[PDB]
Write a protein that binds this ligand. Sequence first.
Ligand code: FAD
Ligand code: FAD
Ligand code: NA
Ligand code: NA
Lengths: 104, 827, 827
Amino acid sequence: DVLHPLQPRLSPRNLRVSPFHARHKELGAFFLEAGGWERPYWFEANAALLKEMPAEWLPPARDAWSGMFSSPIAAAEAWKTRTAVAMYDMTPLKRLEVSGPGAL
Amino acid sequence: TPRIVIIGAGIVGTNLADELVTRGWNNITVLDQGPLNMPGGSTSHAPGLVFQTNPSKTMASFAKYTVEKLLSLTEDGVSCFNQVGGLEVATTETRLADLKRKLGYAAAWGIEGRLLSPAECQELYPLLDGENILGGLHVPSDGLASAARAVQLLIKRTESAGVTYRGSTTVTGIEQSGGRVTGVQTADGVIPADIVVSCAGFWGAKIGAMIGMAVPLLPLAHQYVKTTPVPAQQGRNDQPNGARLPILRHQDQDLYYREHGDRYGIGSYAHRPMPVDVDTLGAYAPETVSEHHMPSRLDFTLEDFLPAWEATKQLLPALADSEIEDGFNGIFSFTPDGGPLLGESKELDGFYVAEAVWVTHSAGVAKAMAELLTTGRSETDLGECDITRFEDVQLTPEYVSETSQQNFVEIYDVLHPLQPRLSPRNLRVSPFHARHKELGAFFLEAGGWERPYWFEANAALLKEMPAEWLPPARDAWSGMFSSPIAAAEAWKTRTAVAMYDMTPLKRLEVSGPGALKLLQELTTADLAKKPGAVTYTLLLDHAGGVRSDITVARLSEDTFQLGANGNIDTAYFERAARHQTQSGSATDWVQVRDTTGGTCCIGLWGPLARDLVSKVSDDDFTNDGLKYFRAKNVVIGGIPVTAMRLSYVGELGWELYTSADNGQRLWDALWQAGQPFGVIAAGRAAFSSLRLEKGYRSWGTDMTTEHDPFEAGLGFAVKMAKESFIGKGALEGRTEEASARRLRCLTIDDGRSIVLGKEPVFYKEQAVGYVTSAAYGYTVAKPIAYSYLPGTVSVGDSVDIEYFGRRITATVTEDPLYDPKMTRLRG
Amino acid sequence: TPRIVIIGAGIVGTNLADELVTRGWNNITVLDQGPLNMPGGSTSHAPGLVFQTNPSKTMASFAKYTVEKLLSLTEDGVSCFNQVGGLEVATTETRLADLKRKLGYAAAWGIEGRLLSPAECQELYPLLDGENILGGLHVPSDGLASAARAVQLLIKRTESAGVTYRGSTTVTGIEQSGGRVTGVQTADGVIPADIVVSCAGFWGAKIGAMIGMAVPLLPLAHQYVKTTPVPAQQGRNDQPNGARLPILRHQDQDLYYREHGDRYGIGSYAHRPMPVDVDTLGAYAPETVSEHHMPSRLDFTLEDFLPAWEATKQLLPALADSEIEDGFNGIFSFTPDGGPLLGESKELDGFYVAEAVWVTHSAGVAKAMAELLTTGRSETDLGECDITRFEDVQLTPEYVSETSQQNFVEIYDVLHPLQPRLSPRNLRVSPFHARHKELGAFFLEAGGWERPYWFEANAALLKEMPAEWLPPARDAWSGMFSSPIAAAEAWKTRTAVAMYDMTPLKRLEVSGPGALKLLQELTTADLAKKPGAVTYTLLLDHAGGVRSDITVARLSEDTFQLGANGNIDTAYFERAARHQTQSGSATDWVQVRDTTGGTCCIGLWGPLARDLVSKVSDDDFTNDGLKYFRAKNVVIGGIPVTAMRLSYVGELGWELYTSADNGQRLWDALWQAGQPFGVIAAGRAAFSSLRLEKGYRSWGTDMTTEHDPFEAGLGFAVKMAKESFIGKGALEGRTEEASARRLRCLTIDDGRSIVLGKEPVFYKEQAVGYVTSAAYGYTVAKPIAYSYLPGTVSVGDSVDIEYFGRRITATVTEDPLYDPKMTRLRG
Ligand SMILES: *Cc1cc2c(cc1C)nc1c(=O)[nH]c(=O)nc-1n2C[C@H](O)[C@H](O)[C@H](O)COP(=O)(O)OP(=O)(O)OC[C@H]1O[C@@H](n2cnc3c(N)ncnc32)[C@H](O)[C@@H]1O
Ligand SMILES: *Cc1cc2c(cc1C)nc1c(=O)[nH]c(=O)nc-1n2C[C@H](O)[C@H](O)[C@H](O)COP(=O)(O)OP(=O)(O)OC[C@H]1O[C@@H](n2cnc3c(N)ncnc32)[C@H](O)[C@@H]1O
Ligand code: NA
Ligand code: NA
């Protein structure tokens, strides 16, 4: 099959979620998955910001292929990270603890 | 004939006066606050590019008529149309593909055009830098309107026929009595009128406030610039405003161009939206109005034009050897959906609008409005143009401002037919909204309502779905706003049981001792039956065209519930009810209420529907308890419900109606009862596919006022034996078998090439139709498309449908495609 | 006088015939399917215990009248009441406390009673095993009714006065024309009638179905047993049914007792609910009806009685030396709220019900119904008895069965006034329900609606709340269904801004050319003002009693929105509207619709309300934009809203109304706008407290039809200058200052002893009133209670309120307690 590089499976999904999952769903997260973890790629709540976003932040139209699994909402999220304050879910990033007198 | 006052002597008002005169109505006064020699609205600044090809059949037809009429409007051997042709160029692959779709519209609506290669574009338009040009769409019949000259020639010939023009005359109010217009107020007194038509351009909302009418347009400014003389153009054109090259669109950069002698004109939408408050413009003394000084022209803002100027030099390098000479920010109108605003006001009988109209469509709008006024109907479908199409949340100043600014931003963008706005959203939701979100609904919006198209919860079913139900891969365009989940939802509707949210479908209650009388005249059904009957019926106009299809349920002697198509229907019934009440006896009064927002409806459909409902109700839902096309009151999960036995999707079950406060309980009761039967929530994508498999006609797409019932295959819904109903006389003698054009079901032979709507349909290489409704049919496992075809094309014949320039073979197929013997519905 | 047919010759129907005759109406036919000497309904098996004390003032008054009337009904020197007194014993501390509350009801309603110690109980009732007895409540005037003998004596004296009795006559249908009753159908023809009253006991729902009326009673069976001769009782009483000891209640074990000569009778509710299908009983040939063979008696099920028999031997050990002799499972009626069903049907003019009535209240119900029929009103408040009190979800067979069975299970339980059912719940929810659950709403229910009483989200505010707002600890009883969170919600309403859900408050739309005319006659206001006015007004009866208080908003010439008290109001307006339409001209027609379930309302109140709304609306909400007690249409968050400026809680702000589909958006828009102002959601506990601080009267509690406007302190709402309105004539000359009894505000001096309602109020040691509305006042920092008091008691006087047997000192206080100068509401 012809498949986009970001194409998700539709099943099995929701195997691993962070503690913020219910809050993310309240905010309209668009989830893709990697390593079993559900990861928001943008939040539909932020679409409401696009109408106040300064014109310099608005990207041009995308073609169909680069537009797959993409949203203009991401521009607003970048805008607010650069100018205000943002909360990213970093839970899925691999975390190891190395301990003991031999760790160093 | 009636005394008419037209407000506005722009291109719309003067064409309307002309179209009325030609139809023998000449008791007309046209008013304008500006001087008659140069009124000073948008018509007085438009450069006049006319591109006819449009996705809307109606707008394309308006443009074709405008070109024809302007070519005919002449004095001293010079017409008001310079037919240079039109060229749209593509600088991206996305745009190149969209030009192939537009070539399809051209063929569908009867406009001649051709796709051009980069080399052919360069031959046609030598000033192009061909490096970035990927191809073009050439329409030889497009060209340049002389709008200001047309206004002057229309004024001259209508004045000769008896029309009165009064310039320098400002309308300050509207006089009324008894709910009907009687006059127009000015500083100097009242001008009497039986009919008033507001043709006031971007002042349309200011006029509407004079009668308490919401007119959903927003005045916005748009930049237009002229260059100094361009060296490459020296000696080529007639001075000072000659043109020889086709008008030029560069939609990837939001620009358009025309020649003005040896100078260029540049129109740009590539700037911030620029809303204008009409109350700040100032009154212009008519003696001061001139080319560069008029209400419609605001000061140029060069800073907004710099990017457009750079993009212009890239496309047309010869212009880099010229300079900007003059620019202005010109005011015109935008609306929430980009459509114009036509028709009779809800608030005042005899008061009409014809506003938010480009020069391009002006003569077509005027013709349609002249037809409406003089005969009671337009010869062209106005469903996308009627002012009454809007829902109440769509008429607020905030909605009109936000959505019309977005329409400006997107004016030249490539957009899919299902593309949603991202804001404003969540205006109207059904009582099931929280449950829908629990199930991962994918929502799109229409009329302000959030509507699930499928549910992510159902993705878990795909791995157990039988292979016969799995559709092939979709291409990128038909794959937009689509999911394979819809196949699973269709599968479970056909084999188990499903819950559809029917809440957004327009619901009217018609009540009172005059309700039966009203509906007996307006519809094509004999509704005088003991309560409990549900009847599918049509509303016609006096020419027999189909205004709407409606389902009528008689709930009691004096109460009927109607399933309708939208707010055009609401306004039609409201006025008809008021007129019957006003002119009738104590037994003729009737009220109409739009109850949609206060109620809700679940379509509970599938072969296990009786098994499910039996767990939560003691009412009799067997065939003896409730027959097909009947209604009765029941209790489900403790909630009083009106159950109607019918199904758009063609399965066992019922539409279940209740008040909004009870909806969540009804939902939850049915949901719990359905667990052992594998109940699912099912969305609009599956709904549309299953309903098309049943051959349902969608008003506005599969039939309009341009079609009679017999052409549409809806003859069964017309009871010709009735003594009286609107349209009966026009329909005498007509049959389905004798109809010159007939609505036909097509299936796509390759099983995979999905079409979407508006694609042209060819029979033996000639364009003879276009796609109305379309969907992938999950039960028949192939794409489906409907089209009108000449009556001589038969079931079993082959036709081609053009999709993005490729011809797809399809077969005329008998419908319904699924269960034509209704075995799933009976017993 | 009118021709009356009464269906049923039980204790109700025969007392009704008697009460009509005494009022000079004797054109009455009474029908019964059973033989007149022993009809065979529940009256033919009742043992006749009459305990007068009840939490309901109306039911207590009905019982007092029954005792008086039965003592008066005599032949051969033997009356129909044996006044042995009544004793309720307590075996738990919970029950002992509840007897102190019941002693309070006794004092409130004018019944003499005393609390007895264990020793005194033993002196009064020597057969008690005193070990487990903790105390008793003794009411000397209670006793034993001879219900079957009363029926026979009533038949005799009404027959003499002209009443016709027809036994062995089964009603099979009801004849009607023009929406009014005309007759009663039997196998032998139609008996003509202007008025029909269904007194058919547990067959009431079967009769109601004959006219399409839902009668919300459930037939249920209840065990009653007689013992063999009890050795300890040998020689003590007259044989065979004599009694000397008080009737005995043992509510902790769901049992009651009486003597029958030397045998005991035992009634038990300590068994599974036993619903009965009346259609299975079989028709009894009248010649076969006898003491042990009649429709109302089903076969005894000993297995259900064994636990009751064991509990009986424990309480009364002498009975262990007897045996069970005979038992039966006797059928009677239960209803969803334990109240009877009285009044005129919604479905049929002139058709009345008087059903689900204990022998205990029978003569009082009959008197009230005789008053209703002969004068148009009852002299006793029927708000808790009227058949029209029920909401539509409360009339389904499923609701009536579940809730009436729960009422049987709980019949003798100690229950708090706010105790909710655990099922059925979530029948009706507002559009804000999901948001409320996000905020941790604590829901209670009324009329089927889920209503937040407080929000757990607000617990986080308690740690920043100023100390003056923190209330003292509550005792266990007043602490039930209460939270300290309510103080925080009151604090923020008074100092910031709060959003109350007003959706459940009854909302009626009255429309049509006759709407103004109807309301001008029914209300005490002059409503003929240009649209936009909001008026608080009263509905009176013809005696000037207060049927309801209503807020009327005139939204247009022919449309009014009413805020009402419940479905008694709905049915009252529906019938008045139909009668005006039927008898009126083409300009008199009027429709009434209950729009509550299709709409919603947010009360946006607090000093920051203008700051909040200004962020989400461009409409003018200043004093010049919208004055106090005015309404206008606005847009908030993109949603069309009807804003009304008034506040139950006494702060700046508005009631904001919209359609249900728009409610969640309106909520979310206001919520987001309110974040910088510290907006909270606020629930019913705070609402009730703040509204009582404003002196608002709650219909049904603070005033009923027993009170005129002047007694209630509502004189300001009566426009005596009006030409005409129902009740005007009765009110001529009356004033607040001359009223013999006046509604007064009391505050509890100790700042901590909260009372709840119905507690008796004493002035110089005499019972002179009782608590109507009550709440802790968070702004005044003390408990508040209202009561009627003799006119000679003044502001500043001291009264005592008895709560669980303890006297609490309170002061008559001027009201409103908060902001009587309305500074918070004006400007
Ligand atoms: C501004 C603009 C518009 C434009 C364009 C470029 C610019 C910068 N380029 C176009 C193009 O190339 N092709 C095309 O098809 N259209 C183009 N347009 C849009 C076009 O100009 C307008 O859509 C069209 O001209 C609108 O015509 P209409 O006849 O509807 O409106 P109008 O010319 O503005 O006339 C309205 C008249 O009403 C009078 N009026 C208003 N209020 C009153 C009162 N109260 N009393 C009396 N008279 C009143 C005005 O004076 C005006 O003359
Ligand atoms: C069953 C029971 C009831 C009871 C009780 C103990 C038992 C086991 N103990 C009580 C107690 O000690 N104190 C008290 O106050 N009440 C007690 N009760 C309840 C009491 O018996 C009933 O609530 C009361 O008797 C009801 O009286 P009412 O007059 O309302 O009803 P009825 O006696 O059942 O009479 C109805 C008559 O209607 C006739 N009917 C019905 N349908 C028709 C038709 N279609 N046509 C003609 N006549 C009809 C019936 O025949 C009946 O006689
Ligand atoms: Na754009
Ligand atoms: Na019990």
